[PDB]
Amino acid sequence: GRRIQGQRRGRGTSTFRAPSHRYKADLEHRKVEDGDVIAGTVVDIEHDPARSAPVAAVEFEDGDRRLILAPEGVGVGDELQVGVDAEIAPGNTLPLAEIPEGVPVCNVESSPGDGGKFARASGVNAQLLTHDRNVAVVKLPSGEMKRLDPQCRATIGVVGGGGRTDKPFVKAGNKHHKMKARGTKWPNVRGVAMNAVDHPFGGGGRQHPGKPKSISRNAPPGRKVGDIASKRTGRGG
């Protein structure tokens, strides 16, 4: 047959690419020689086309002007600080070690200095639970308990824009406009509505999948469709 849609994706053609050229900034923690002295002033609050969430423009003492992954509650004028000795208030960034356990955090680094990887979407947050001289245990929004180097920097507070998911799109048109701001092919045609040549679920006098939908982890691309390595399906039990 023909390569299935999931395979066209990888080639990275226009249709599957994100409108990068239309994006604003790659949100990452600033680099500080040391000392922490680094502080700056919120100059404005903008909309981030890549995350459908607000972002804060900040002017730093040493002249640097960069957009920042804004937590909820940051306003123009506020003074943010980044470093080991940063005060402990929302919007400030400092290593997990210097952060008091029990405090909600966002934009957490996977490894010290990577600029933040975890908890960055609308209204989410990580939860610093345990400290140590060797391991900082954080609970990520997925519920998992992650062990991190206490040297990993983070931002205090939860990400701005919480509750975005609460309102339904209501109409195809709204999805449309959102989708146009992401690296995604939309709308979605069901495999079972295709021809046998286009998808392992395609074909038939009526619409139904050919075999069972749970596919092995070892299935090859072109065949790995449906419920991938499902440990279970349905809702019962």
Added chain:
RNA sequence: UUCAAGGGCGGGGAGCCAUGUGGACACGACCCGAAUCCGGACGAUCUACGCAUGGACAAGAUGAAGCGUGCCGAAAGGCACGUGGAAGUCUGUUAGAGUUGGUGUCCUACAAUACCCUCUCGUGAUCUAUGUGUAGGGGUGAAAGGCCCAUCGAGUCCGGCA
């Protein structure tokens, strides 16, 4: 070969070469005849989808939130009138897009998809120009096996190839 016996093959000198010709086998193999398969190339001037930069949508209808005033109320708020002007909202041959019926006209056509009447959409998932990207078991596809220059259940060109 065989204890033995019995069988198999061969044996009392005709071949070799040349020329014509009959026939066999491989090769295009008397000649034409078809749907393939494979290789390397050429195409997104059509069209599909995405991107960049521009452009387009008479007029009318309905009257969401919000806000105002007045009345009622302890309050909560409620009621009336106005204001406001929302909507993949309505009417609409505005422009523009689409293509339901007539199974009309045409059917050596005006035309290798046309004409007329009728009909759908017409502020949006809208229409459109130009630029630009994706290439052949690959694209592209709101999925019809649709579309990729009158060519698609695997484009076109030449070659493999007689």
Added chain:
RNA sequence: UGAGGCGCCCAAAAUGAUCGGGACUCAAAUCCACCACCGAGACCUGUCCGUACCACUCAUACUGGUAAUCGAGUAGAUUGGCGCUCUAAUUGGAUGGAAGUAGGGGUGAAAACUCCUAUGGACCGAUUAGUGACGAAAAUCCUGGCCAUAGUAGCAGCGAUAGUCGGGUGAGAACCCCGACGGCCUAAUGGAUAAGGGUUCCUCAGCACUGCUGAUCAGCUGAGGGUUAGCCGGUCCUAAGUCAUACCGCAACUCGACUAUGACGAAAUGGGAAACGGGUUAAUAUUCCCGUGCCACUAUGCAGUGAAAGUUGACGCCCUGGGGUCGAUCACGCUGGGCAUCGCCCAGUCGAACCGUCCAACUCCGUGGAAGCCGUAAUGGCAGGAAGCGGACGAACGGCGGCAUAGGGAAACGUGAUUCAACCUGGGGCCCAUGAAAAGACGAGCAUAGUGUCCGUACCGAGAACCGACACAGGUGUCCAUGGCGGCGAAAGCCAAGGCCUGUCGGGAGCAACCAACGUUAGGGAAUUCGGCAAGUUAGUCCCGUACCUUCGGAAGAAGGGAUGCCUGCUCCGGAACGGAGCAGGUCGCAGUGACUCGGAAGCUCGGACUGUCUAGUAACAACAUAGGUGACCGCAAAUCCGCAAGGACUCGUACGGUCACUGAAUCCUGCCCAGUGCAGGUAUCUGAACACCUCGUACAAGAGGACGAAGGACCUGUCAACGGCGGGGGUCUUAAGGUAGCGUAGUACCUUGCCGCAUCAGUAGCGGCUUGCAUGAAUGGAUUAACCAGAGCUUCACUGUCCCAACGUUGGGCCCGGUGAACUGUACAUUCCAGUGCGGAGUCUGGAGACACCCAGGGGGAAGCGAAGACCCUAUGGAGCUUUACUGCAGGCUGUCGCUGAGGACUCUCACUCCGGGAGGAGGACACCGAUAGCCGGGCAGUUUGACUGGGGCGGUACGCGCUCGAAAAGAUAUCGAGCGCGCCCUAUGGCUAUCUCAGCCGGGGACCCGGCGAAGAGUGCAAGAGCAAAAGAUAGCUUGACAGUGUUCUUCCCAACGAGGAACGCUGACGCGAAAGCGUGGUCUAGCGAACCAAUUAGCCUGCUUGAUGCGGGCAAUUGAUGACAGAAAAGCUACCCUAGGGAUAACAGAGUCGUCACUCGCAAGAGCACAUAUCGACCGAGUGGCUUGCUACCUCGAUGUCGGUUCCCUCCAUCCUGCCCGUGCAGAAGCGGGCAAGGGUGAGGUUGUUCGCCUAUUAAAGGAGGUCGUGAGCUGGGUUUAGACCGUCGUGAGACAGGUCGGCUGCUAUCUACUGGGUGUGUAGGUGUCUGACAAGAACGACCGUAUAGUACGAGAGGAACUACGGUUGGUGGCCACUGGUGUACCGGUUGUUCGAGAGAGCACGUGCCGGGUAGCCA
């Protein structure tokens, strides 16, 4: 009373009867005899030829002879010869005329040779030996040429119907030019342009080409000429993105991703330093000229030290205020024009860039001091300081002044106003959407001077300059959206400016038939049809009023009712409008949204929630999408995906993420099942590869085995919003469960038109209820649902030419004429018709009939008409796309091992290596990555296979290898999906031999046993069937292993007649068994019980392996065992409705043909009943037939195609008669019937469900008969069904996909050559004329039928009831004609009136070929 001969009855078929025809009757029939004739290529006979043979001969050269016993022939074998090219030898011809060609003479059986005449004007042969791109009627053959077609189709159809009269030029004028008159185009048919074209632009000269006719014209032909820029574009900048170099990959590159650098990337339409006005040319123009202005750079000079921070460039969608120019309009004045019953109507009234100046809005400052005020269209503002007041900053393509005793105008060369595009400047709202960048400019003065190069510039920009082969009705972007009336309007209609008469052939006929578009049709009003398809109705605006249902939004313009003009005078809102809303009075018409513009309405049911998407070119839908619901994977060095690699998408992203799937808004819900399959987790034990390790083996090695054991599997568990499942039986079984809520004859229900009800005269429809559901059912989602819909079905009102039933009219064709001028098609012949025959579907054969030739128009019956090597079906050891637990492999994922790889069955470390960090350093770490390999998964991908037979193929079956009886025709051989039935073993004895013996069955004496008798064979002999066997081939007993090794002969397998394995018969050699011995034993009494090569294992001996010896391990001679049952041996599944090719009528579907079991009808016999009575009537059994309508069979005809069902329309026919006429019987009183006979003249109708044929149903009726014509009729129509591609449901399948199951949607080509007929002409024949006739023959249905009255309340009859002959009146159907009457038309005509234009008036044009409305003559019509 028996028999015979001939005939008669029995006896019905579709265009015109038949014996070939005529026709025949003491025969021209039939039978018995007879006589004479005709009649083949046979037979006889003369001559000749060929072939074979004989004699003679070198000869196959002659000559002679023989053939009663020689003379046909497709495929094929054999043999002699003719012609062509060029070579060679030998030898000839030709300018006193070669070859070739045309016509003609002679020879040869013939291929072919030769001559003569003419033409031609330079080459040409013969013999012999060679040579070969050597011979054509054919291939839907190739190329070229040519005829018919035919002076035919087209040059008409499009909402753009366009011309006419004069004149000019010219050889020539319908279409070239001038004038007038008349028209066409208004977002275009006007003006400016992008792309694209490329000289098409202008001038002159032309007409051979092109131009749908002509041409003096031209986008044509030829020759000249034409495009002028500091301030318009390009150029410069950067966008999506592209390239180049470097780096790295790759076997390699012209290949490839990333990262650097550089460059490229916008001419209408991104950003951007600067130009305006006038004039000028045949053709350019913000470019030239005149005038005026401006920008940038540089130089000089004065000023200035400022100078880079900032601003700008620079930005989305929706609503809106303010400023404001042009335009348009209004008022008044001036200038010019038009009109002439008034006094109106039209045009103009001008004047730039630029320089200077003014400034609303926004923002801000001071003052002020609001506790309720300020303000808006709206939101809003304020003690954090409202209003007011004063001030800073600050806009237009705008005002104002200059520019300008510039320019322009014949002149005047105005002033105000409203509404205000452009342009300027604000306020508000929206986002799960956030709406470029860079160059540049500003910031940052002024004088003077110099410089400002390079490229583009013509023209078209489209119903003739672009793309579409064309001067193509198609396609093709931007700006002018402000010209007038109109009105909501960028709408219609009408009209300016501007353009055009080139959507480029004309002339003629009241102009017929027929066709395209269209108008109007009385009465009826969907009766039409699959269906209201098509058409029609309704319509604008205001007032009143508005149901069920509902997601409260909607439904809704529901429905329904009323109003609507003009004129006079007014009121209200507002600053006002040349804006809007009303009032009073007057008044005209059939009609006041008067044209135009402009909804028909209501209800029930099905589907999908909605807007949206789709099969460019037969499917717009219920299909796709969607929000919403749900499950799955993943913590980012991720999940998923692309790449060979280097690398990459997702990702400027981070679980409120994004990937992979299912369902498909809302509402109420979503039961049971984990056995199979899938996925996932676990796992004592079992299984599980390679490396390393251990054992054996080998001086090593191959090799065999062990130990250990990863993923995986077994096993266990979880999981169904995972594939999917939810039955039979009883008051459990398969296989886990055993169908819950709902829904239900469904778009799912076979039976089926289910039953009941609604509705209708009548309802296979529709809706409601019931419902056992062939075969409903829960995210394979169930139910239900407001709103929405070019989605499917149904009902009502309204409407109407859909119909009854057609008519008249309008326009363009058609017809005739001038000009232009194709194509399809053509084996030949052809004036046919009826029958027959023939490969069974004939213009051509056979017999008859008819037929004088040619031509014009027509509608298409036939040429199984033209078009297309059938797309259905089968066949081919064809193709492709698709599927899967088909075969075989290949990617990819998981896992063990080795290398990178290091230190001290679990562990630490650091140094490689990887990742994070700018670095320091941090994390990880001998793992991971990468290279190599092993095991598991692995339709993600590739190549293939998936057999044959067959009353087509499939399904079923195996007649696919074997044995027997019969078929099989008394030798042998012999077919079918022929009839009966068997074999794929079993046996150590059930083999072999010898001895002894005789069996079944019956009888008699003491079903065991014993005795006697009869007893040729019926017993027994392993197993089919047939055969054999009695001192045995059987039984009993004993002994034995011949069921032995080796090797043959022969038969069979395979008749004849080649072919292997296998089998058998009969020998020999050797060794044995038993017997006294002869002898028997080559397995079972005979015919079934079987298997190649390659490879392996096995048996005994021997041969052999590369210079040589030893060892190991190989190679071989002979043979046994292991299987190919498709059995003379491949290793092997399906779908295609997306399909494709080669073919086949070798083979199916419709139709034809044959048959006639079936079907229809009849006859013979007549049991029987019919109160008695076979035969008034009904009529079994059985028997004999006829038809060719049904159904089946067959496979003859057609697969280089004979278009399907039904319907429709139009024609002919049959009779087995439904009605009508004439009759017979009756269980015939009458009336009404029942049955039968003759009879085909005429009639046999309208409707409701259904695509139906058929059939059911209703009301009428004299009756509402059946059948044939290719199941008549698609070069006639329709297209509802069947039967393509889309989609759904149920069932089946793992799946692709399947299902005379259902369902929605789904195309109808062609110009008539011949023939046929309907009508019209021209000629010839009879043989100059006028007029009038005749009548061989031909056609008719020209008439069919019914009702009523008198007869008559009569005959008959108890009565009830109730005729007839005859005479009358009328109706219906059909037929022919006609228009006084009624009616239709009547784009003749006359009137009314709306909009607009001509100034009003008068009088007119347009509004589609009448604007609309009202009336309507003639004619034509019903």
Added chain:
RNA sequence: ACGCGGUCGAUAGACUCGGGGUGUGCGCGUCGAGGUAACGAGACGUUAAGCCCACGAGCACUAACAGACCAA
């Protein structure tokens, strides 16, 4: 193709009658709700008016002229 007439003529046209179709012309006069006036839809009269006719009659005014040909 057919039929009729052709000056010894009524065949076609013009004109005038007759017979028909519409429905009362232009202009002028009077009235007219009103309005200072300007103006004024419309009513009545003149007016069975005006306009029109594919038919008939009268009527030689116009045109059926001129003339060609075939023919035993």
